[PDB]
Amino acid sequence: GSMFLAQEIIRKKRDGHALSDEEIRFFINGIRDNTISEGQIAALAMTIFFHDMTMPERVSLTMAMRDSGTVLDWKSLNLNGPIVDKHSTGGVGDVTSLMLGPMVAACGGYVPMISGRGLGHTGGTLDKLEAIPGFDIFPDDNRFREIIQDVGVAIIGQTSSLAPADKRFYATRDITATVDSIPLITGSILAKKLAEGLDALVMDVKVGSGAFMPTYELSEALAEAIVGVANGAGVRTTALLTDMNQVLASSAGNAVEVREAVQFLTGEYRNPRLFDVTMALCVEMLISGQLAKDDAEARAKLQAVLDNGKAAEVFGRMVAAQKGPSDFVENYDKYLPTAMLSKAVYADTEGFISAMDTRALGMAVVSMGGGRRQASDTIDYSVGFTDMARLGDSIDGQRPLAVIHAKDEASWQEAAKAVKAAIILDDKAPASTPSVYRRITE
Amino acid sequence: MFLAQEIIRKKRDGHALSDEEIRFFINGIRDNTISEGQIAALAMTIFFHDMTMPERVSLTMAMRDSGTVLDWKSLNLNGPIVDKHSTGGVGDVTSLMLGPMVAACGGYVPMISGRGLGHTGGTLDKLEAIPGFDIFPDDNRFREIIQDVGVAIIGQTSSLAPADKRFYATRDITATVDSIPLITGSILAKKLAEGLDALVMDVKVGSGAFMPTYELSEALAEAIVGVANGAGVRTTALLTDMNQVLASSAGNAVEVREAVQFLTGEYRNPRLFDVTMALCVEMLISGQLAKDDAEARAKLQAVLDNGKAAEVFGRMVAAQKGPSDFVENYDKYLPTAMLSKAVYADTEGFISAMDTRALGMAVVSMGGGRRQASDTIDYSVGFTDMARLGDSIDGQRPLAVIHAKDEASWQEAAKAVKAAIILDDKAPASTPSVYRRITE
Numbered sequence: 004g005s006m007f008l009a010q011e012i013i014r015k016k017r018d019g020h021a022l023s024d025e026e027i028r029f030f031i032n033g034i035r036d037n038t039i040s041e042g043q044i045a046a047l048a049m050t051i052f053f054h055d056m057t058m059p060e061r062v063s064l065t066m067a068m069r070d071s072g073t074v075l076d077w078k079s080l081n082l083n084g085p086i087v088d089k090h091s092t093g094g095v096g097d098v099t100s101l102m103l104g105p106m107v108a109a110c111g112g113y114v115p116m117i118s119g120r121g122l123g124h125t126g127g128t129l130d131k132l133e134a135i136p137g138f139d140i141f142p143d144d145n146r147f148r149e150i151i152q153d154v155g156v157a158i159i160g161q162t163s164s165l166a167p168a169d170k171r172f173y174a175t176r177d178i179t180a181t182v183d184s185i186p187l188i189t190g191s192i193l194a195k196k197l198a199e200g201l202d203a204l205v206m207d208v209k210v211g212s213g214a215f216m217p218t219y220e221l222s223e224a225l226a227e228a229i230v231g232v233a234n235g236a237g238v239r240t241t242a243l244l245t246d247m248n249q250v251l252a253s254s255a256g257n258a259v260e261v262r263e264a265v266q267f268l269t270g271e272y273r274n275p276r277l278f279d280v281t282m283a284l285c286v287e288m289l290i291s292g293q294l295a296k297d298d299a300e301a302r303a304k305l306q307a308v309l310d311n312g313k314a315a316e317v318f319g320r321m322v323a324a325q326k327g328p329s330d331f332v333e334n335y336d337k338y339l340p341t342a343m344l345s346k347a348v349y350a351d352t353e354g355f356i357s358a359m360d361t362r363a364l365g366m367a368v369v370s371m372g373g374g375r376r377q378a379s380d381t382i383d384y385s386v387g388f389t390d391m392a393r394l395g396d397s398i399d400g401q402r403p404l405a406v407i408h409a410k411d412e413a414s415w416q417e418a419a420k421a422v423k424a425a426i427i428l429d430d431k432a433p434a435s436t437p438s439v440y441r442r443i444t445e
Numbered sequence: 446m447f448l449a450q451e452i453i454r455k456k457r458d459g460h461a462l463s464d465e466e467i468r469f470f471i472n473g474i475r476d477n478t479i480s481e482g483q484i485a486a487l488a489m490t491i492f493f494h495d496m497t498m499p500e501r502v503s504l505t506m507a508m509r510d511s512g513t514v515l516d517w518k519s520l521n522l523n524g525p526i527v528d529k530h531s532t533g534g535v536g537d538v539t540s541l542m543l544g545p546m547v548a549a550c551g552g553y554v555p556m557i558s559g560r561g562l563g564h565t566g567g568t569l570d571k572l573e574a575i576p577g578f579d580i581f582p583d584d585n586r587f588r589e590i591i592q593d594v595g596v597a598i599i600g601q602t603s604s605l606a607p608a609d610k611r612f613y614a615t616r617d618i619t620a621t622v623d624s625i626p627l628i629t630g631s632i633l634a635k636k637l638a639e640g641l642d643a644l645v646m647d648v649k650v651g652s653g654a655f656m657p658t659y660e661l662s663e664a665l666a667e668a669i670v671g672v673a674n675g676a677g678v679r680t681t682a683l684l685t686d687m688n689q690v691l692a693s694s695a696g697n698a699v700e701v702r703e704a705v706q707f708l709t710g711e712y713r714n715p716r717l718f719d720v721t722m723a724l725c726v727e728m729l730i731s732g733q734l735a736k737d738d739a740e741a742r743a744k745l746q747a748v749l750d751n752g753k754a755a756e757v758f759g760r761m762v763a764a765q766k767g768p769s770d771f772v773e774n775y776d777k778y779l780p781t782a783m784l785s786k787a788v789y790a791d792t793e794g795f796i797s798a799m800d801t802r803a804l805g806m807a808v809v810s811m812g813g814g815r816r817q818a819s820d821t822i823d824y825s826v827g828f829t830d831m832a833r834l835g836d837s838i839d840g841q842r843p844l845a846v847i848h849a850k851d852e853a854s855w856q857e858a859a860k861a862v863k864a865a866i867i868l869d870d871k872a873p874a875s876t877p878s879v880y881r882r883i884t885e
């Protein structure tokens with residue numbers, strides 16, 4: 004019965020016609036309910052790969068995936084500001100979320116950051132926060148709602164009932180060569196975030212060797228596609244192209260990135276590239292969330308909550324609300340686990356850093372124990388890199404490539420070989436590039 | 446003496462404990478030379494700081510080695526030693542079919558199980574609805590049953606991970622139950638003491654699940670898989686549904702009747718079939734009895750459908766001193782409740798939700814389970830013909846048939862069932878029986 008209706012929808016898309024909202028939602032729910040077979044899913048996916056989808060179709064697909072599970076509704080809490088979030092294609096050393104949420108919350112936004120785990124070398128935000136003893140990434144949503152109401156930000160992982168149709172849909176795409184389709188990718192990127200019930204959203208689309216899309220042109224095209232769909236779905240959205248040709252923060256790992264985020268919020272250390280990207284993303288959130296009129300007003304408000312400690316305090320109150328220690332901001336080195344062996348790694352040659360393989364550095368952290376080879380693995384939260392050298396730095400015997408935090412000497416030596424191999428020196432200094440490239444609006 | 450507080454202080458400060466330190470502490474728990482205060486402190490340090498995989502493995506193996514560990518190599522059996530463990534449910538009768546099904550496909554299944562706890566049934570209590578059935582054969586009769594029949598379902602000794610006894614007893618009064626490394630070591634220690642070649646874990650999801658949320662159930666399943674494989678036992682886990690009763694009955698005798706009729710083919714609840722079959726598949730694959738899913742299910746369907754599995758079950762019941770002809774004549778042996786009547790809902794919607802925790806407690810209150818260890822059980826009481834999530838409910842379709850001792854307990858059970866089952870005008874979203882498979 005459903006199989007009959009499904010095949011008509013396939014035939015309709017097969018022949019180049021646009022599907023209706025009602026047909027798209029029927030098919031997405033049949034994927035969710037297992038009333039449409041894998042063959043039929045693959046066939047539809049392949050007709051979309053070939054014929055593409057119009058903007059109304061793309062919007063219907065994303066909203067249907069979004070409506071396939073829980074969608075958070077914030078009206079009853081009567082918050083007096085915008086619900087807003089950031090989404091990213093990810094990167095090594097990208098810890099922006101841990102400062103951005105508190106900074107926007109301190110400026111009057113409400114930031115329900117539902118995120119995830121590792122996924123294949125880039126480090127998941129949830130694993131980083133679990134380096135904090137006691138920190139609880141799975142509050143029940145009455146606690147979640149309370150934290151959003153009281154603190155303005157929470158970072159959690161209750162994702163199971165969010166856009167569940169994407170699960171079966173992606174699984175079939177990934178064995179039938181129908182992953183590589185912009186309308187399907189856009190749906191997968193957006194559905195879970197949109198299920199947060201956002202007023203506004205900023206999308207961070209990486210550019211560079213360490214990016215999800217491999218070329219500048221393809222990053223830009225993906226960002227425009229996301230922006231078009233998200234706004235069509237009723238969420239005020241912009242995107243930034245930002246640089247991932249090297250580690251973004253000065254550290255890569257879990258505990259080490261939490262430490263960097265606290266020091267950024269307090270002013271103890273602000274990596275200038277991480278600062279550029281974080282500030283730029285937060286600006287979009289204030290403008291789209293209607294908390295600031297323009298860039299200069301938004302940057303003033305953001306710099307103010309960095310300067311008077313309010314953003315650091317929101318982070319501290321979030322850590323305490325999610326059951327970490329109440330004095331984490333003041334005493335983070337007491338609570339974050341320390342690796343047994345912390346030792347700088349030096350290059351074999353002298354010269355300038357001209358290039359860096361971020362996927363390889365990310366895999367080096369994973370191999371140290373800082374990430375999961377398999378999902379059943381346990382993370383050592385103390386290991387990783389700090390003091391990362393950057394593109395353009397002078398490297399000699401007195402200037403290390405990084406400080407490696409390792410659980411023992413054997414894994415330290417293995418990480419050092421991987422780091423030295425991932426970083427390319429050259430006799431002449433490279434040219435500089437922006438940390439933030441194009442801002443993309445609808 | 447002194448080392449125990451040093452071990453506590455080390456973990457309090459966020460440092461990892463070594464294998465030597467963990468084995469010391471566990472043995473001290475078993476020997477009763479480490480006090481309740483020191484147990485609880487260490488548990489609270491673990492709750493705050495968690496444990497690495499080497500610590501989790503050390504902990505689990507230390508608890509396993511704190512008592513008897515079975516060894517099957519000397520009997521040289523021509524198949525793998527495999528078993529299943531579940532976090533428990535209501536109507537979770539899978540073991541009674543799964544044991545025989547796997548034994549009929551070449552596995553050896555030393556199922557050392559347990560009784561009911563809280564709201565969930567216990568496999569051993571269900572089997573004791575069978576007259577004569579002896580859940581405590583000596584080591585001798587136990588080995589011979591495994592050797593000659595391939596499966597036996599029994600209760601455990603004092604020397605089966607005894608360290609867990611004081612450890613769990615302290616956790617349960619100090620709010621240190623809710624720790625995945627502690628839970629994992631508690632779940633696995635007793636199962637790995639069986640000397641298994643392979644193991645499958647059934648981790649329930651939903652309103653009757655041990656963990657409250659899907660992501661917590663998922664986290665637990667992953668941890669168990671990591672530790673069990675790290676302990677040298679090929680292990681996988683399934684996330685299965687417990688947002689309603691799994692079988693069509695809940696109780697003891699009524700669930701034994703359902704298991705027999707499933708094995709013979711008289712009646713097979715399709716959700717119960719999915720979960721049972723899926724669990725058996727893992728055992729055949731992990732035990733190297735089948736190359737893949739399709740070959741495993743083909744072997745399993747075959748023994749369900751040529752009577753071999755039902756026959757193995759009857760041999761097992763007879764070997765453990767139940768009747769020779771229990772499969773053929775179960776109605777002659779299982780006890781009948783005094784009062785058996787259908788219960789009807791008050792509204793006319795679709796079944797949207799089911800509070801399985803409350804259903805399970807309703808069975809306990811009828812006398813089908815225990816509140817204290819010393820309680821006795823009426824094996825005849827319980828529910829049959831359970832309505833299911835998504836069914837259309839009107840005045841001609843009951844929520845269940847309630848089997849009770851007398852009209853008063855029948856009324857009480859009917860109030861609990863009507864309260865536990867929520868009807869709605871709209872058909873709910875479909876829930877699957879198996880949410881995912883988790884391997885290493």
Ligand SMILES: Nc1ccn([C@@H]2O[C@H](CO)[C@@H](O)[C@H]2O)c(=O)n1
Binds near residue numbers: 380626
């Ligand atoms: N693969 C995984 C994933 C999670 N966990 C455990 O789950 C709890 C919360 O994430 C934490 O206790 C964490 O250790 C785990 O043990 N293994």
